[model samples]
Target chain A: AFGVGDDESKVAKLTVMVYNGEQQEAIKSAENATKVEDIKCSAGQRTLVVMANTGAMELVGKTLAEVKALTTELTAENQEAAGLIMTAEPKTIVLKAGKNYIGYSGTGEGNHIENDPLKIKRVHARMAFTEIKVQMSAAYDNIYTFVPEKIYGLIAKKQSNLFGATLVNADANYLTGSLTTFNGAYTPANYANVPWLSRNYVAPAADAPQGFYVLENDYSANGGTIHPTILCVYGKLQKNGADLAGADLAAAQAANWVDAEGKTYYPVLVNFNSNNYTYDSNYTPKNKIERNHKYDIKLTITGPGTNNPENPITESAHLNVQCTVAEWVLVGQNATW
Target chain B: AFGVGDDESKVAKLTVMVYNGEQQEAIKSAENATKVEDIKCSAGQRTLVVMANTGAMELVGKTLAEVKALTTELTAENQEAAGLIMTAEPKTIVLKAGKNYIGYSGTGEGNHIENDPLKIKRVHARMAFTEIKVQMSAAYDNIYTFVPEKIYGLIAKKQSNLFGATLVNADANYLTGSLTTFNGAYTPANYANVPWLSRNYVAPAADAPQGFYVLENDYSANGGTIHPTILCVYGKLQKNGADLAGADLAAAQAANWVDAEGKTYYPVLVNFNSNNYTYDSNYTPKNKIERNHKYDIKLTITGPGTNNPENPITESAHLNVQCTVAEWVLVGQNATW
Candidate 1:
């Protein structure tokens, strides 16, 4: 009994409901118990109920105050494991009629405890490129066919605490409270040198796609500037609807070239937001990633891409990007280039 | 290269996207390839693309007709494994311009191939009791408290095919085409003898709840009557805000009693739909479960429950159940008693 008294035999039953946006899972436990147990306590007895993800079982026998004070760090490997480490606004609950096994009460029409289900949610935020469509002008479509090969630049905070108790400092290590890339290294000079994060697969029937999972990175809470996440698509430029060879390949290599497989390949890079590859020191991102929210993005390509991965294409004649943010229930956005 | 041509060096690239309602996971492969591979084929080459859940790799290397003719039985253990074997409307694709790596195209404004994403869905249907509120009248709340212990009756087709090509027949084995209960046995004589499916936990903070995963069961397709899914909640009935013992227990035992742990417990049963526990020869359920969809249910308990688990509460003074159905993208319902 860490903080639970020996009188646990008379403890009240605790019932919990867990919601993961799409569905709900129920958990029932007795006071001072580490695992599920029988309902043994009598009516009117005071019992404790704890809520945590399967990864944080260590917090089970502790007092409410103890759990609130303890903080857990989140990393790429442990993000999914610590997914449900959310903060309870009231921290602890005191059921009015423990006999009825009531947990939280909602102020519904009847003012009944059952009207409100005490629910918790996963703390990680989600970002998805739901639809990516590329269209070329009639003239360009005839002369050149762009085939996307890979994507880059999915950046997120490297580390965060579940409760937002710790603020990311400038001096923090890249593995701790600093911003980092998910699948590529941050090379400001040549963005193409940054390893590709994922292949730009044409949508295939009978398959599920992938998205990014991120922890809350709110610089506003710490009175610091925010650094939003960005994406870049990299692919080859085909001539007359065919792979370049001999003379065509020689001309492409003379302008922009990367040596691979004994072939000179020109990988054009298109940023999700602006065509221009470079950003100023005070550049502000359009989207701010928050906890328990989802951001859906759609990209449309209207014109040609830049040879330099870090250089932005300034003219609106080339690209457009749209985004929408909503609570974890769901949300979306659109973009073009 | 089972069916793949011997010119493996010129195999085209294949891209696949997997969607499970919430997010999409991307998969890319080449002709004659079992895993992710590089883009090696020429502009005029044709490639093979396969789509499947992480569980069904056997579907690879087989032709479209082979996959269509192959029927896999869905059981409790294999239901999740066989979750994504849905039928493709056209069965196969013939890309117009394999040079651009296009898969499927939607009839959008531009009529471009990228306008449409070739996607598939999970074959399983989901059912969830989102909110369960027990509201008692002033008179009932003052003297009695009903604490729910467990729930029963979540019946579904024991076996189903991914493509719905196999119809359940009268002579089929119970393990294949017949109906079965997920958490309880079917006992017509005494419904209480059926084990409870899940505990009726009062909503708790910081937790996710559970739900039912069902395969499609369409009786109308076979010109047969439908046996809809039902749920039953079992709980203890306390008197005057206290546990009844000795003479008080004896009085209750004289009326309705269940023996357990040397103590007499009076367990009451409340069905989800109606008060009456028994169904006649021509009972029609308001629901028809389907694939790639979700059903949300809500139950409200108002009056006293029946002593016999199989007997329906004839009068309207006891309970009400409400439900709504929608596609796997999302849907909902409500009920009261």
Candidate 2:
């Protein structure tokens, strides 16, 4: 194990997504996880993040460049035929179908449906899988699929939503071969009519949101189950939305402050619900997730460390992660039930 | 400032570029600062320093949704022509320049560089500047532009590079522009001919790497300079590379560490060379930045802090960070000096 470290096989790379935020916000708010997406760096990491991340060093990893990355970057001068306008930063975002971004522009409220530039939205991002290192583990197997943790970060931030959720929709023939029966039918509601906008698939991450649902099919035809992974990002993690009342906290009378045997209360195991994700040795955060949203997250599990001089131990988790939606969340503000 | 808490006018927003360590590492290894780029969020505070620093939520006082108060959701897709095996992921991210992303599938890494399915390098993110709660501040003419600090949080983790640099290249007429400079010239070498390859304007943020660099321009050119403004989904900010290492260290030092008067052991000021970046700061960890040719970086100190806390004052100094592109370290593991 010492010869090599962990994350040895993970395909890591850089992405850049640029767009006229001013324009899109007028149409929709990136505030919601379903709304927020990763920008693919078209130039690739060599020119974008790799050199900087590695300090001009060549580290083995991956990079991704995308069109969504360029959507925001296109200026009014370049946006003419591209159909994007409202370049001066629109106000009052709206939620529409995906086709609305086809060379669309302008900022409008949710209901003012129009095919004008206001309805169009476009995004470009860069994606690449760079195997900078020639060395391989077995040289026999390669991992091509992964649930993006960063996408989860987007969810943790409550940016994007999961597939099949309230804000997000799915279609039957979306991606015929896709494992699930429903593929994300997500689109700027205003633009869904555009036949050309139905090609890209933005998958969800590991920690699926409650509102966001995931559709996972067993390789076998009938064993598939599409479920919603419930992980509350905004509110406190708990089984039920109800708070533990004072009357409910009897202090475990029998197991009070001191364990009659004392022992300085070596350690304690606490049980809690999953909706509000919590942390513990055995307790997993984001206990459950489904395949509705993509994970493109930048998250942190800050603090909760117990270490002293002689007993030096370190444990803290902060990550910039992304995942395709294997989960979901309701579209509106902090609406966690 | 406290009198009207909720009443504070909702002015423009900021876009922050925050990354976990991933994007950061990529930027450092990149050759220049333009690569030091990440997802641009929005900021409320317009201070360049606030805009330039690493991303932090505290910096982003508002929620991301609040930033992109108006962003419509969208999805776009396309496929290659028949008989055309397509490449997927980053390079192949964007749909053909003029074509729409329809149903698409093919072999890995398509033959045509520009026709790759995964080449959709960007997404359209449009945010609007809504009802401004303009305050009649004696400080200004109601048109105050505060840098949105939230966007800064997003930027903190991203990698960046010095963009907006005056390019000295093979062509004269096609000299320099912001995002589309070397457009047509990119080919086999620059890969200009590659369909979706980016050659123009300073690599779009989506295309920037992890390390951070500022694009230094003729500071004297007060007007016409692309003074980046902050806008965000929730709260994030990102600036063009033209602004590099123009840190007001004294201010930063002051804000970073509370001043302890009688106790003189305060944060001492020093340059990168003086601190020996490779040697100072926390264990100085191992630095593998070897040289193709031996060389070092020099930071010119423009001014020194006056009063030494005794007189109780200090002036923010501006130091020009110019990289003497060291003689290439082609031999050693280090490729850039």
Candidate 3:
């Protein structure tokens, strides 16, 4: 959760300055200004400077006057004209596959000035699972074999913008746009009711360089009110070294099946951490997905999973997890279920 | 197999010039010369120019005088010093995973100059298989299922250099280096005797973006005498939607097994084209693998494969293939068998 940039020189920053028509005319005199610090405007012009260092840090400490006295240090190269996009209307940007920066205005300064340095953050989080393995204990390996089928999850948001007029809150308008769920077995017709990301199938072990891109979901910011993202694994819990079919499968489904289609599948939930949180007296999520961060999860299955996909087993005895968070800052977690 | 560059300005070319100490000293006067045409030396200096256009073409139509009279046109930008590495001794270079150029001196000009352009070509061939599919022609899908396990092959050569002293012949020394075989089931100990490439496992279908890289094997150059490379597929032929194991597998092995370990597996060979050639009194191969070319193969399995791994099923009724070759010219062919 707390880590510095691997390279200080490569850190990206975004600074926004607000100017009235009179101040804009004055700044026009410096139209070809190269550096952000080179532009000059009237004292009436208000400016908001944001910085996203390698790691997250508190931007507010001194007074507004003190913040103005401190010069903004530019680390990234070729950042000329980083202050020209100052307009009354907010701008929205599409994030590509990789890193992106989002900036917004801050509040509470009033006439004291809006030039205090804030922070621009990334809008998406990265989730990667490697060394995902399955192995029954010595007692069951010889008699049964566990074969993984698919890995799926629910993402909180599908899209985000780069700039806004003010800091976004839990009830931000963008968060209600759309949600994404990934189900490997779903058909194109099923996607009409529920949008889905691309599918992922598990091989002998999940060693391939694969991951998911999820929009940010900060439960802590909203007092644990919003729904957190969830990761799930679906597999086949075979018995006697063979697949169950006909009456055998029907009997198993009658006893333990929980999927909507009554399929005999062994599904398990991937718990990021051990924290306990009660939301609306119904959902108890354990982790808050953050932005501009990478979560590296490793899973090892030591026992048979639950037979119901809707009621996936989350017991600590069968599943264990360890999580650490930081910025593109990486969060590494180890879990066994 | 014939096409021009998408953008003529981006084509890459290589030109080699040979010179003695006296000739080298004369060219020293043109030190720091930018373009290839900028340097000048005595008439005794022998130069060999090579071009690898978007497609392959013949270079022997004109005589030595006519070739000398034609000026070499430069297409790529920033190629100012493309002629400085000329030396008497041939140099060898490692071929990276992607495109690489190999140049060598041409023959038969005798007392005539060696400066005529002889095309430099890529040493390795690219083989990609996409949209690989398996279907049961409406007759067998209900009673039997064909689940693919692995895609394997034998590469004729493991390593190749970029430059040679003369045009390599059918018995080129480099072609006899180490050969590579890819078998998903083979253990590390088995690799001691036969080097193996990375393994490839197939899912329900082979739609993943995957390919193989093999060194050049021009059987046509040696009168189709060398053993051509081969591709193979391994899978399981299950009945009534269940896996075969224990005594059932043993009975199947006793009846139709051909692997060294007597494993009950189905294997099929991938035939590139329809042309057939006899390498010896016993061996017959169809394709002459060429360098600087791309082979796009698409496989479709229509029926149950043979059980013998050593003698894989090559019947046209069961397996189908399509290959294309070109200058990375692609050659495309479709074959059922």
Candidate 4:
């Protein structure tokens, strides 16, 4: 009885890792459906499983062994992601609601699976977070301005996203390319436009770490599809913990985000402090050293939807991840710190 | 190695039930990978899971009868889901996920457990709220809006979904047939435009029913595809239980969801309350005469994706019965009284 359509989905794309002209063509040909592109490892390549996320998962039941380096560390733009492997046992992992990831290691060129990146067989387990999961950790600090807090920092706990009285009425906008901003409140008039980028948004105190990012909970979408941009807070040092401070916490810096719109701005408004907190500190910057921490990240979609009468607005949704940046150590020491 | 695309999804769907079209589609069409267009079900179709929040693992096997009645009563609308067999088995079922409902059910319809609902499965031993057999006996309550302080002249429970402090928001625009705004947020800014019906919005008083819903934890996308949508809520008045005061729990009503651009609407929002007392309520309803408390109900979601997103969009998602409306036995005698 109910009917809706996918304006952009095509067919399944090429499962072939080693990208080839043919594979690209296949990807261009299919979006909603999958098409068999190539067979890599004709010389007996590794069989891998490409999961829902772009990250790869190994179905071959093989673990990565190191040539003296502990393990393979994948860095997104030079930062560490969760370690590819945690436990030693060939575990049967039960999937969760969010993002799951893996790495594809092959010393080959495009298309021919046999001659390409190792093979991925089947995928399981999503390591992504959900709206509910995020809501459970609702990090609302909308009322804070730059004034120092009178009480001891803020409070934190688990709660639902009921859209209660926590009205964050700031002017917002959406940008593309780098980091962007999109602001809008319940009322039309008070809204304003702020640009964002992943770099130089938040400036930490003297101890600020380099190239750190604070994740935002919102993002942008256009053309019925989403480019998925986030308000990454760079140039700050943060420890572990939640709600801006404590055991794993440290002071925050003033920050901003960049967008595809070629503009720059700051939008980490929601926190526990009544003030924007820019005065005291910003939200927690992801633990660059500790391996894992909460990042105040937001995904923003720019345009294409602007032309539609209904306006195809897309934001960070169904996008979840429980990731950390772990380090390397010799087997005997086992501990990083 | 193994791929479950639209074809396999369709194939698998067919296998879940029988050789039906749905089942057939599950295997070869990846129907399960798609979003559903519209949804509905028969009355008294849902089943409840009467689980004691404190139980770590004390009781496992056969569930109590009331627990069975309450579950099926909650999802009355989904009793006829495509693949679900309403009748099957031992009248008493074990506690599990995906099926056990959290709404209320009393009286005759509250005890529904078809002979084949369980698919010739085994019945374990456990306690329940309903008299018949069902999967889960989650729990139920109108504890949100029903402030006995206002309605019954006695303080049963203090619950309300006022416009303050709430954090959940859902936007619904009907792309299918007409759907009127039966009851929505008291705030016009909700923008959850319901097409068929729109009425003067009214904010729930501090004494409305806490609504119905099921909560899930630690669930990963177990299958190849994951897109969950809570289908229906059914409440069969228990002899001694309470009757639904109203669906005061969620101020936002349901509307058809459209996936295309210029579709007028893209999504629907389900707003929760703002302030919180931590779900601690002890008030009971007296709307039903079946104080003996034997009842049955069932709720389930059948069908496919409403709009399958193109690649890179990641349209797969899991549906957790976020919340619901429909109380039970607001007026009863002789039973638990």
The reply for model 1, stretches above 4 Å from the true place, is A1-337, B1-50, B54-57, B60-66, B69-88, B96-100, B103-114, B138-141, B151-153, B164-207, B219-226, B244-286, B306-337
Error of 3 at B318 (Å): 74
Give per-residue CA lDDT, model 3, range B1-337, as digits (tens): 1112322123333333333321321221112221243334333324333333212223343433343332221122212222212212322222233322232235332232224333334444545555557775432346456665555554343333334432224332221112223333211222222323324563422334344555544444334233445555566667566764544454434434323232224322233343221123464444465445555555666534435343322222110111111111111111110
lDDT of 2 at A3: 8
Listed models, DockQ each: 0.00, 0.01, 0.00, 0.01
Query: What value does the lDDT take at residue B140 in candidate 1?
Result: 73
The CAPRI classification for model 4 reads as: incorrect
Best by TM-score: 1
Ranking of all candidate structures by their lDDT, best first: 1, 3, 4, 2
Q: For model 4, how does the per-residue alpha-carbon lDDT over B1-337 read when each residue is reduced to its tens digit?
A: 0111322112112111111111111111123322222222223223222111111122232333322232211122211121221122222223332333212334233233333222221111111111111231111112111111110000001111111122112322111112323332211222322222111212222222112121111112334532121111111222113533343212111212122221222121111111211122453422211111211222121111122211112122111100111111111011000
Residue lDDT tens for model 1, B311-336 = 32243445689999975764465778
State the displacement of the C-alpha of residue A55, model 3, in Å, after optimal TM-score superposition.
Answer: 24
Candidate 2 vs candidate 3, lDDT winner: 3
- Candidate 4 structure lDDT: 0.20
Worst 10 residues of 4 chain A by lDDT: A149-158
Please identify model 3 stretches exceeding 4 Å from their true place: A1-16, A20-40, A43-45, A49-120, A159-196, A202-208, A218-226, A235-237, A255-272, A275-286, A307-313, A317-337, B1-337
Candidate 4's TM-score reads 0.13
- What does the lDDT read for residue B151 in candidate 2? 15
